[PDB]
Amino acid sequence: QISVRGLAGVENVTELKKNFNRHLHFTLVKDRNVATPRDYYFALAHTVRDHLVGRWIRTQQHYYEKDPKRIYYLSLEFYMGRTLQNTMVNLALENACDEATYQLGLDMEELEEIEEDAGLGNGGLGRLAACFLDSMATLGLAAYGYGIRYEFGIFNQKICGGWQMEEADDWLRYGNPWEKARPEFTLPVHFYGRVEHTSQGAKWVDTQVVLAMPYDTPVPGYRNNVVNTMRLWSAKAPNDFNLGYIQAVLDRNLAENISRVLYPNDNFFEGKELRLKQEYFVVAATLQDIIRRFKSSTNFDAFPDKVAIQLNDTHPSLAIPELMRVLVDLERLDWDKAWEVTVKTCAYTNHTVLPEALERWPVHLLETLLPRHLQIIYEINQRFLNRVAAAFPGDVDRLRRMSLVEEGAVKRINMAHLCIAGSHAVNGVARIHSEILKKTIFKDFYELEPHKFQNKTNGITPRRWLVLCNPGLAEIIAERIGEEYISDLDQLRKLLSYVDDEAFIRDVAKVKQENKLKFAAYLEREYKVHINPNSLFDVQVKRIHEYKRQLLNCLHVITLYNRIKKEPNKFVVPRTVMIGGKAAPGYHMAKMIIKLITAIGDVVNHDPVVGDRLRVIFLENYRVSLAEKVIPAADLSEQISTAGTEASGTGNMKFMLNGALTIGTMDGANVEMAEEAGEENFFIFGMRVEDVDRLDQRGYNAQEYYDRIPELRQIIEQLSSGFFSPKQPDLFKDIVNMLMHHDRFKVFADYEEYVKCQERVSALYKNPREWTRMVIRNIATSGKFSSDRTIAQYAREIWGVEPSRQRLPA
Amino acid sequence: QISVRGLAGVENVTELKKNFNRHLHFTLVKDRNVATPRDYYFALAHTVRDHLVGRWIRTQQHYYEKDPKRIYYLSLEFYMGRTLQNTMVNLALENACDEATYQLGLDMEELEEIEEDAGLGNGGLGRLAACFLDSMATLGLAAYGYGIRYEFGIFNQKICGGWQMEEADDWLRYGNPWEKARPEFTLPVHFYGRVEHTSQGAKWVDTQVVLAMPYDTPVPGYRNNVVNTMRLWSAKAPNDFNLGYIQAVLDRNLAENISRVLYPNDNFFEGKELRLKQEYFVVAATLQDIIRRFKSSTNFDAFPDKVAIQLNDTHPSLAIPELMRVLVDLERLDWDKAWEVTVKTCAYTNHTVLPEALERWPVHLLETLLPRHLQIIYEINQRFLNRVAAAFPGDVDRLRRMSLVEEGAVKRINMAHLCIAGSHAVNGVARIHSEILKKTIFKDFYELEPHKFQNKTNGITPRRWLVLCNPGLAEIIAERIGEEYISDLDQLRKLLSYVDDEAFIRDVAKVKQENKLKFAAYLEREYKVHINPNSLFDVQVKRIHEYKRQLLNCLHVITLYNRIKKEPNKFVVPRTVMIGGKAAPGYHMAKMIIKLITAIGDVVNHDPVVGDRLRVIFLENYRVSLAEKVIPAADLSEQISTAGTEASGTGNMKFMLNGALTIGTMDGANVEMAEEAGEENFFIFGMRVEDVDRLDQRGYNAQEYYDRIPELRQIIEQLSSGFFSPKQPDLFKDIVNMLMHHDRFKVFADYEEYVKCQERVSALYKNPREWTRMVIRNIATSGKFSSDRTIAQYAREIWGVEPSRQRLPA
């Protein structure tokens, strides 16, 4: 059909068809009269997977012959989403399969919709991981993602009476044709026990053994025939485990619970033992795989020239004392040498500065669960603190601040401090977040070792986040400037010479209008809800968090509503405000925010005076595959976190790429986005980071805003009095109370300037042609935000390897 | 190589080879340089499974077009063993695959050894089930096996210091290429709740839901292109299950524990709740499958003309009140009509008369777990007892004996009584066991309904139990009389005209000697143990049980040993005595017996005076695949249960088929075996059933035998004094105590005649040529004992359907 989707040749189409039929019959054991859409999706999936394997084998073979330096990306999260379309796209099979399946009388799109998301992640962190593996493959890096194969991913969100209900995401119910179980590289992981000292060093003994079985899933590069591996571990009990008899067998579940469910907090940190076991599990099994792969090439000097380990936040920070444990206790290197190898291997990416988000493990936990690692960590601390004393003699306060060990009611190990100490590079995820790191929470560590601190502004993959979810926009871009930009997204700049081209202007706007028409229909079919597709589409999608200030959005919505009820016969640009996201299950406030949003919907959406001028939709079960649908359909992107809190953000990037304009604060990557497009082409409002500080020193008194803004006073009055909850008039007193007395995020301080800026958005939207020209300026400058750029920067400046864009043979 | 293994044509061989290579690459994602034997076994397995599926689909299609009456075989046990070779054999692919794999430079036999047993059974009962499914397919019956897909089967038995250790049989570790998950026919099963009465009848409510997911495994008939289905259910939790959040997800294991492990008792009955849930699970999910399949053909009159349900013992007896529940409560038939349908559908096979083996469920259990079924059972009882009163007025004792409900400290439901009441046929499993049923435990029920009681002597499948495990013997048979006998085993009779044929005599003996030479080697390679292959091979293999009187064997062994130490320079026919079997984990005595056997081994096997004249081996991990090896290699078969206790036995049949002579008592099928071969061709000793009764009425006093047999007194003295346990001299006091004061099985009563008869075995063995001629008479008369005969008898006399030997098209 459209050109970026590859060739539908007569060979390939005829061949796809017979392989589809072979799978349907031999693999699925069905015939065309009993097959359901789910069987059809499978046959297609097995058929496409057939095109990977040849390439997959040759890629692993290549890395053996060539023995390049290897990148190991350790993450507890890999938010993959669906695999089928991505695979076709990267393999140039999209038009072929589409043709083949059409001729068999099937609609491919209907089949794509049957695939479960692999929701092995909560949000931006696990999805960074996913974009990174795609980019690593595309750039021919010899990279492996390592994580955990959770039996249940992020929960599916149902709304009942406007409250979030969580249900189990049983994504493996029907099988996963993408993975390959490799029970033959099963590895032991040890827990508990005790440390014994001998003539010949420490020995960790009387431990419980849990086996780690790996599953491999192919990661295909973009049209370069590189296929890398994501290896996820699964917990299995040993056969002599516990081994009255029945219970012994039934208790095998106790071990395998390790990889059973993904922790769904991204706000808070809970010191729960299961979580720590998960972190150790992945790190222990991964290091033996890394070490084994290295030995098949006594001398660990070369280890750092052959291995790079990137730590996605501090979740796999135990890699550091685990690498010492192996080197010192099992391979018998002296401390000082093993330490040099360790620091030179490991690097650390921090994803937040929120204090409640940082891992601080109780010592009593590490002591029972991992007693030798505790010894190592203490020995690490001591030697570290002697470096500090030597560099800053007399400074005893610096000593207590920098310690890996927090003194207090319960002793804690600060896992960030460990990562900084044991890594040669530490990075933030956007320029401003990186400066904040050096100026505030890691300032002490920066003065000791300024050379460790870097920046690597996040990016997203334009294969998933443009070609895949937005084929129409990819096409019109390709018509003008070619296809090269799909893996060199800087070329999008060439679009700046089309900014006064009437034919492009109509085409950009035409595509936006289609994506809206299509999403508007998805809203009716799957969820019986009625939207005007000529309205502006105002979307905030991301996890629910106080810092992300969905509440601020709510306040705007309520204000537009109140202005409309005040002058009903005045013209306002209509809007459909969509807000969607999951709340972590114990985060009471977050859950109240979801409730408020639906409450506003019940009032606003059924007011006959409002008409179709304002609609408020909460988007159920936001996740990767819903993001691929709503992002191409959006006009306004809401990125409105209090300055200084959102480390980078990546949703913001997906929207810029797809023709939405951004309303946001100068926070995280928003800053570089505006810098790249010009501030004129951006809707910036609110305090900068400096303003927030000034406010913290005076003290933030919310009353002041309430006393001076009548429009705001009215909203609080409505919330307090029961306007939005006529059955429970006091339903929202917690929010009204938080807003008024302990808002760490200064919702009221930004309200005035946020509303004024929202008025400027409506004004520009009334002039279609200038709206679109601004869109063009955004899309045209979104190049920097490709995860290809990001990965090339890690590669060159942290891992010490060259990206290569060259094909491998077919 | 040999003719019964089919054609190795040039088409098939070349085609096997490329499919093997396709699977190795596409399915297993390996290449010839990294492949391990396990990968090779898989590729072969997937290649052979490819030849089933076409046939499998056409068989299920046929049954739809033709709509014949359907047999549902309900069992908690299916002891399948390995599937690969059986599949090749039934499909005529053995010589082809052997050729193909040879040309790829592989040894097929080495590959066959890598396959796990599906040990979804304990012993004869679950293996009857397996032989029956093979025979049902071979006879073109539209039959389905239904059971449970246990995650762990019968435990693997290790010996440590001569004690049994149990470890978990994790038979699914590496995948099972034979099954097909069919998540789309998932079915709800309900538990707990309570019964509510309405205007419109009872309603079972507030129940917990457990889902049953079916797995299908192909059951290929012998060279007729019929492939039937074994459907095994797997327990899965629902997604809103329990649905702080973490525990909710972790507690999903509580539901799925249902299908987690197979109960390994075959002696005793434990009223454990998990077991009852297993029995209900299988019965509830199976009945909806049966009912659904029936509706796709309001009127249940035809139900019994379209459905037959065979109950393998009382384990799935809840099928009966479950069928009433559905008919009465969900489809709204009146009692009397639903009852007629039920009795006409169901039949019951009893497998034992041992009182501790019978299921008697506590009422408090059924009341909490299945409260409506309890109501039904009471209503069944009442109506049943009114039939009894009417037929035997005044007989109040008969009323208490016949009741489904046992009065007592805790009320129990007698599940046998339920099966008899709710079934149109009840059968024993050998002629003598069937008479015992009618004369003793079911006598009351027989006088009420003599027409319900039948016999169906057990059988075994000659495909697995001859062609497969003994290709050499199958060949020489085929040389003389053709191949037709493989599915018409009566033709083995034609061998009686070769009894004086010198060339056959040498060939029969030649094969026996090979199987011995080969097993003798298997003993060294896998278990470092040293046997003389010219000795007589004396084997007792079967579960360890007091009734099966392994102890009696021990006493003989010890006696041969003591006679040898008394006259060391006298000639005795050498023997290798092998005894093997698992003990149920809580059966303390059984476990002591294993211990004794190894103790005898430690003394006997290291006496230099004994030489290689006597060896005593305990065979570790006896199971289906070890049976396929040791049975062809045996000379003497030990079937020595106290008369009246072994309902039928089937090991006895496997040995007759494979050229061993039998030493045994007149118990179970032994009786019909001797009747078929002539008593002269059999080594019969000991009490008949009548003798046992006479002894029970006088009282069995073991002292008497001890006082009159010096050879016996000496053995007891040795056991008591520590001769076999020099470190723990009192190790065996429990056995010596049981033997002397409470042996329900009269080991001493049979000892004298058992030894005399063992002397007659040794005498005949010294004359090779007459030994073999007797073997010929056994093998030649083993026809009756084919499970094809058995199934044809169920078919004609219980199920009301005709066996058909006709091919279906290819």
Ligand SMILES: CCCCCC#Cc1cn([C@@H]2O[C@H](CO)[C@@H](O)[C@H](O)[C@H]2O)c(=O)[nH]c1=O
């Ligand atoms: C000391 C160890 C404790 C770590 C606690 C944490 C954290 C997280 C950060 N981010 C986002 O990660 C994204 C990817 O970098 C960012 O764009 C976004 O700004 C982040 O909030 C998440 O999405 N989830 C998180 O849990």
Ligand SMILES: CCCCCC#Cc1cn([C@@H]2O[C@H](CO)[C@@H](O)[C@H](O)[C@H]2O)c(=O)[nH]c1=O
């Ligand atoms: C009231 C319900 C309770 C049932 C309890 C039971 C039983 C069993 C019978 N048999 C054998 O089943 C075999 C197959 O019929 C026989 O040949 C052999 O003689 C039997 O002992 C077994 O092998 N295992 C058993 O558990």
